[PDB]
Amino acid sequence: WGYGKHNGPEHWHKDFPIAKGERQSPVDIDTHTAKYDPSLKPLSVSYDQATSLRILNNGHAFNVEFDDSQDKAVLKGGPLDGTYRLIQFHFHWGSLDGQGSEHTVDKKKYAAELHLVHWNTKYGDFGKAVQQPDGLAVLGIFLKVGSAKPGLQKVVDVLDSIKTKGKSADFTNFDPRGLLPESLDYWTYPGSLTTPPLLECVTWIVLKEPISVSSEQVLKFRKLNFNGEGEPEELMVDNWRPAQPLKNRQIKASFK
Ligand SMILES: Cc1ccnc(S(N)(=O)=O)n1
Ligand SMILES: [Zn+2]
């Protein structure tokens, strides 16, 4: 599977039939249809002890991985029951500033989207968690092109060392708090992984406020490769799944 014409999103359902399922992601967020829930708790993002380990090009995106062997970087509150531990983040982005995000907002595409992936600690580890309907919480953050995000630069600068599929590099002491916007206002809905295996295990929490990154920063994302070392170059761009049918779901807002 990939993002090309012959193996991309419209093909995924053949190997992964859940692609046509009842709670797939991403979705368009219609901001006028979303229901304010005065009941939803504030989101709690506690990344003060987050310990990054490694950054990896997996042929689809790049992952910054975290040591999730203790409660160190956790998400709780909001729509969530219990505690979810950060395991990794990655991005989806476009070939042009006009596209790249997976979720859309009133059909607006952003230049990219950051996914901070967390697993429910009641299931003990990530592999067991993805088999559960409430196994994961993914915090999604839109990126627009404008002013630079200083806290992103350390990620940008290491991408030259992981240009091709399979390459990884040490990436310790990275603070994901530098990737967060001011506001934690959010939309939330039940959905899925947005890449194969497309498992319907995610509580999505999508922040309303985008972060700004510079054109130069996102241009460096676009220098990555889908292919491995020594292979014909295919730029890693447009690694986003388009919006899927909302079906029997309601998107809730934490704000009015
Ligand atoms: C870890 C993982 C696998 C597949 N998809 C996702 S995503 N894009 O839904 O966050 N994350
Ligand atoms: Zn993702």
Brief characterization of the structure:
Belongs to the alpha-carbonic anhydrase family. The strands form two sheets. Strands 2, 3, 4, 5, 6, 7, 9, 10, 11, 12, 13, 14 and 15 form a 13-stranded mixed beta sheet that branches.
Could you explain the architecture of this structure?
- The active site is at residue 60.
- This is Carbonic anhydrase 2.
- The chain has 256 residues and is mostly beta strands.
- 8% of the residues lie in helices and 29% in strands.
- Strands 2, 3, 4, 5, 6, 7, 9, 10, 11, 12, 13, 14 and 15 form a 13-stranded mixed beta sheet that branches. Strands 1-8 form a two-stranded parallel sheet.
- The chain has one domain (1-256): Carbonic Anhydrase II.
- It is built from four helices and 15 strands.
- It has helices at 12-15, 126-129, 153-158, 215-221; strands at residues 28-29, 35-36, 43-46, 52-57, 62-66, 74-77, 84-93, 104-105, 112-120, 136-145, 168-170, 186-191, 202-207, 211-213, 252-253.
- Strand 4 and strand 5 (62-66) form a beta hairpin.
- Residues 115, 117, 138, 193-195 line the site of 1.7.6 4-methylpyrimidine-2-sulfonamide.
CATH class: Alpha Beta
Q: What CATH architecture would you give?
A: Roll
The biggest beta sheet is recorded as: 13 strands, mixed
Specify the structural class.
mainly beta
Question: Could you name the key traits of this structure?
Answer:
256 residues, Carbonic Anhydrase II, two-stranded parallel ribbon, 4 helices, binds 1.7.6 4-methylpyrimidine-2-sulfonamide, binds zinc ion, EC 4.2.1.69, carbonate dehydratase activity
